[PDB]
Design a binder for these strands. Sequence first.
RNA 1: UAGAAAUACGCGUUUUAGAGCUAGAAAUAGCAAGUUAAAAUAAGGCUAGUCCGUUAUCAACUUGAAAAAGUGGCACCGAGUCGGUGCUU
DNA 2: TCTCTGCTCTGCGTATTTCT
DNA 3: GAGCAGAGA
Length: 1146
Amino acid sequence: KKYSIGLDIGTNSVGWAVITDEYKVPSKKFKVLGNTDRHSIKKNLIGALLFDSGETAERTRLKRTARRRYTRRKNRICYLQEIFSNEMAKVDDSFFHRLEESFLVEEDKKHERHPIFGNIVDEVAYHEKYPTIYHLRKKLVDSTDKADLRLIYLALAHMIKFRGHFLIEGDLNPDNSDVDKLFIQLVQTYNQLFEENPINASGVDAKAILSARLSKSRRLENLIAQLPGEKKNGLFGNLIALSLGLTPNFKSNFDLAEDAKLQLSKDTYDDDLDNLLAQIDLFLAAKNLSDAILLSDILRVNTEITKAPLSASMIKRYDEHHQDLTLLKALVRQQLPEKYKEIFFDQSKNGYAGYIDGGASQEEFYKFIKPILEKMDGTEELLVKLNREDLLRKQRTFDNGSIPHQIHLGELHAILRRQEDFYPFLKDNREKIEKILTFRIPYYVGPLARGNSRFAWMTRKSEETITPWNFEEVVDKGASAQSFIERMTNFDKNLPNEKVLPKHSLLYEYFTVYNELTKVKYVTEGMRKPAFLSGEQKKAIVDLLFKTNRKVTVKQLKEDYFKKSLGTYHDLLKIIKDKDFLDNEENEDILEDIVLTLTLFEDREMIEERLKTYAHLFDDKVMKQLKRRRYTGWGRLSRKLINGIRDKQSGKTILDFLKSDGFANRNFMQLIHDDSLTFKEDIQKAQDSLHEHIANLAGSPAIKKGILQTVKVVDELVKVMGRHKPENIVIEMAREKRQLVETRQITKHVAQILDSRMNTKYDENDKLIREVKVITLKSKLVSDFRKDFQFYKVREINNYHHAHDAYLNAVVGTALIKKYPKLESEFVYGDYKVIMNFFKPLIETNGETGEIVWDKGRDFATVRKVLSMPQVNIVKKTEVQTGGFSKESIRPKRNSDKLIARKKDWDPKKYGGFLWPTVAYSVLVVAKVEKGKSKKLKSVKELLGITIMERSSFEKNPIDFLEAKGYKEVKKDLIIKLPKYSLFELENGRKRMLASAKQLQKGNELALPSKYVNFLYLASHYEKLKGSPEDNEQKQLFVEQHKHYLDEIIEQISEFSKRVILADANLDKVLSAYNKHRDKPIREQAENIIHLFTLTRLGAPRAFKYFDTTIDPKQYRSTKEVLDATLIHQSITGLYETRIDLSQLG
RNA sequence: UAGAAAUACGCGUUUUAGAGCUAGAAAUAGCAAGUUAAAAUAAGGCUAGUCCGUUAUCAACUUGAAAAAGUGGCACCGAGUCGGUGCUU
DNA sequence: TCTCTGCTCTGCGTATTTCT
DNA sequence: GAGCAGAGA
């Protein structure tokens, strides 16, 4: 009557089993609903549930951020058009309308087809004058003529739209650091400051480090050659410590700045008051040469002086492209005239036409064309340009990502400065346009929502619409940054209503420095028994040792106190340098407010906003130091548990006990685990949907699906056996490779989940009556149990192994707890306060109680019988598919009606569009369709695919949507929603899973008997066993006596494939390759048949390789066959079905 | 060592614009040119925000707007995917 | 005109921050 | 899985 549930949770499967107390699996007749004639079906209580893996939110978040990026870029262009509109409406009123209409075909445009000037002659004159946009940008930067307003708009919009990166914090400017000649300013500044004053010996300047990856080994000898080595560090030539940041905060070379500790390049190069700016410019030349090195990595050489180096570089790139194109065309005309057509006309060969007009990248084009250049001659400069990857480049490439926004800002500022005198409105709001260019939303403000986003946290000061200009006076930056941090910090596990402290909080140090010291003992000559440190002794070691050394260290613990962390305290005592104000605890709440602020915020002026209320306590220079100190890391527990929770025994919260208990020292965990002290019931009093009850819990997104499916499997399995509760549930835990780590995460909470949902009734004497022992096992035990008693799994044949593993889980679990009852508290979850050889006398018992726990003999027979069962409930979970509407690439225009439009008014016979849509779920319809030249209603019944785009419009009103598809007189009740992997049964018990509206999938399972899978495991692993010798030699002799098993395996494959797979050509190719290869050795034959079971695999058809050939898979490319089949509606365990005979409809 | 969120960048794809010329009933053939720009980048939605739109959830049936709740007898002998036999309403 | 066989097609590279 | 074209009716 009693039973036990075995489970096996994976990333794609949940195997379940139900055993009775003699390890037999029961079977029952289950009721069949539906209009079929079969009314009751016998089923075994063992099976598995397979599903697609759950996906992370990663791709969704990336596409959401991309959506917001494109929205904000379009808003930038709209702001710029708003600024320009009033004046631009006097020279070309339809201009912005033409730019909007530019995508449309010649007929769909309302205005003339030439966007910029609106006629052919001015447009072609413009394109001959400025071949690229960069010619126009350089012309507007350099020339001083009054330009046409439209060209100004194109230039400004081209910088505002494609504005480059923001990774450089400073004021990067290519108006002083164009060329690498900074030696004169650097050396003259050095010799103006210093006395002995060496002089230049090599002018290589930045081009030394330009040629290599950064290292001391590059720059040391080069700076010695540049400048003779009077000062091996601090020569103040171009050197790595001044050019490039140092990650450790090592002291400076010389006491010009008190040996200031070095940092990376940041805003801290503007403020260095503590050691440099208040005590001592060389560093102006240093940052100038940093500008020099980085621009020389990104900007080519400029011999002409100009305010637009990037546009000049792009013009140079264009001109060299033109010259090498002309030279290459002449060379190919002269020496290889037959290749000219292939190179310059054929746009599918990765030639020049395929690189410009086709889809070949620069790398592919170079790889194609380089043998052509090498076999020719006169190509030397082209070959070396190709070797430097600077042959026939394009102005817009993958390498433009290194360009910082300061260069575009300089060019835009130069254009506005030149052209402001002719257009007054350009001068009136130059700051507005620059603000449009340079504004970013801060990463701590997040989306600028109005309470309709589930991601936003922004708090706005005023009901105004946010814009780049009014941003500062509309968003409360302080509150928004605080909310940006506070939403991520987690509550403590003991009281989920108070925010935890920073790790550098002083109260957390009065936890920390005495918590470890509480359970340390001092054992010496002074007494005969070990004693904990007294509170007075703890205070003494703190005051002497820990108040001079941050880190606990047992060597100095010995040789400091007994022969005679506080890092925040030490730093704050080397800043304020007053021990009184730190030892003062009366004022400590304001000090924790300071600690909280320096933990929350990193942008410095926000630090000033939080510190304004404390200016009266301290002088200004130490607030400037406070800007430079930053705290990271958060504490593990809350302020109420720190101090607030007064006890009823001593007036001593935990940290008061850690400070001073004298003897009988009690640690944090013992104090909170104690109930006789009034902390445990406080934790108890401190404490309606399973979905939320797992949502905020930790876990990989894949495994959480498996856990929820496991819980629903347990619920339905309990429901199946008439609400009688189990007494054991066995769970996978491979704790001490993604599978290993994901299965180790599982048992942090699944045992809690099952124990909470299972055990729910209690009494007054005990607050839970333990009725289900939640067993938990490691896969190692089931592994040697499999490999030690000839029950081998092979994963390639069938999905029964999941259920088989579940069965093994249950049997070894129950047989272990019955064998060692006293070891419940090691494995049973719910009650704990902190081997395998007995399976190998024939009858084993607990002994302390005479119950039989294992019977070598009938038990192994029962297990063999269960593994040899043919019927195992495999159920593929039907899911409505969700995700992207279609594949992402935009196919060119075609005269096909399968192209999906990109927009409402973009007919995809003129504009192209997407292909390969994804069906959410198919829908069986039965209606009349007007087929035939003579329009007359033939009744039809066919499947239809409802794609993800059409899903909402279908569920809004199915009848109108189907009538729009052409169907007439749709039988509304007869509409059947069929998700993916909907299961159908056909003749001879041949099942098919519906992969889509127009494709099927294989559905049956080859239930190969246990002797053959044992043989195949013993064969395919032929000389890789590494066990006891005589055992593997008798296994060798066993596989040697049984070669005929191979031939009967092939008959099984032929029979199953002739019954269910219906792939004739695949079958006799397999048979012919077998018959022509029957003489090969056993290992290769058995391994190739193990690949050969892919023919009979559940799921999609897939190609597979034999000894000498790959056999193409037979795809089932139509669903006409299932419209007269038995559709099966399987429950989650698959025991409850609902068969619909579709042939009786319409 | 990974999950989850935010702010940005560079490409890519698509259609249009960048007058192709000559010899020709041409099917065409010779020759020149090629680097750039606009717009879109899930269709779209309404609370109209510089917001949201690809994560999670989901067998069937009966109630319920929804949330949700409920609905399927047992033992034994066998096993080609479950079959048979015997009690019970 | 409506179903089968055989072969081809498929968005990408980076950053800065967070919290766990 | 879908797409596409090229044959069997």
